Amino acid sequence: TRSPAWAQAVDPSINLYRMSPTLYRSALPNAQSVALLQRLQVKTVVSFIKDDDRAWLGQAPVRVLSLPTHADRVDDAEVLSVLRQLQAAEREGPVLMHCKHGNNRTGLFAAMYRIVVQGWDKQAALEEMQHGGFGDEDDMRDASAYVRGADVDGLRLAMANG
């Protein structure tokens, strides 16, 4: 993250980075991450895996939004749905989205958020994804292949027509 527009590191032990005041990006958090999430005022936790976050969140008054998925099966339709839901959650307050390792599934949706929601030019989102310190390229080939393949114009058009 030497580009200032890339996500800013907050807690590397769980691969936690800030994209904005209302959007964070991480790997699987644990019980001792809760205090931090509360200081960040996270109101919603979005998971792209089947693990039940309520197990480590305990009594934290956050909404749990479970969207378990597989990077190698994500399509345009799924992305639009996720981005719409992330956006809606942001309107409620700050959002944490995570997967297992915080770099493949999360890197896919983060990258698509950059492109479709913030209008970044694809190569730029891809560079954040593969070189932002979230992991190495070998960890995220699925995310990479989807992003490389996605029709950004169509996704933007479809996003506007919702």
Residue numbers in the entry: 34 to 195
What's in the article?
Native TpbA crystallises with two molecules in an asymmetric unit (a.s.u.), although our results and those of Koveal and colleagues show that it exists as a monomer in solution. The two molecules in an a.s.u. are continuously visible in the electron density map from residues 34–195 and have an identical conformation, yielding an r.m.s.d. of 0.1 Å for 161 aligned Cα atoms. In each TpbA monomer, additional electron density is observed adjacent to the PTP loop that is consistent with a phosphate ion that was introduced from the ammonium phosphate monobasic in the crystallization conditions. The phosphate binding is typical of DUSP enzymes, with main chain amide atoms in the active site PTP loop and the guanidine group from Arg138 strongly interacting with the oxygen atoms from the phosphate ion. The ligand-bound and the lowest energy ligand-free TpbA structures can be superimposed with an r.m.s.d. of 2.6 Å for 120 aligned residues, indicating significant conformational changes exist between the two structures. The core DUSP fold is essentially unchanged, but the largest structural changes occur in the PTP, general acid and α4-α5 loops, and at the C-terminal of the protein. The PTP loop, which binds phosphate, undergoes a maximum shift in Gly135 of 5.9 Å to accommodate the phosphate ion. The general acid loop, which is disengaged from the active site in the ligand-free state, becomes positioned close to the PTP loop via a 3.1 Å interaction between the backbone carbonyl of Thr102 and the conserved PTP arginine, Arg138.
TpbA is a dual specific tyrosine phosphatase (DUSP) that has a conserved tyrosine phosphatase domain, and relevant phosphatase activities with p-nitrophenyl phosphate (pNPP) and phosphotyrosine peptides have been reported. TpbA (PA3885) from P. aeruginosa PA14 has been reported to be secreted to the periplasm and to link the extracellular quorum-sensing signals to EPS (extracellular polysaccharide) production and biofilm formation via negative regulation of c-di-GMP (3',5'-cyclic diguanylic acid), which regulates biological processes including motility and biofilm formation in bacteria. TpbA adopts a canonical eukaryotic-like DUSP fold with additional secondary structure elements that distinguish it from other DUSPs, including an N-terminal β-strand β0 that caps and extends the β-sheet, and a C-terminal helix α6 that packs on the outside of the protein. The active site architecture of the DUSP catalytic domain is defined by four loops: the protein tyrosine phosphatase (PTP) loop containing the conserved catalytic cysteine Cys132; the general acid loop containing a conserved aspartic acid that functions as a catalytic acid/base; a variable insert that varies among DUSPs and is predicted to involve in substrate recognition; and the α4-α5 loop that is equivalent to the Q-loop in protein tyrosine phosphatases (PTPs).
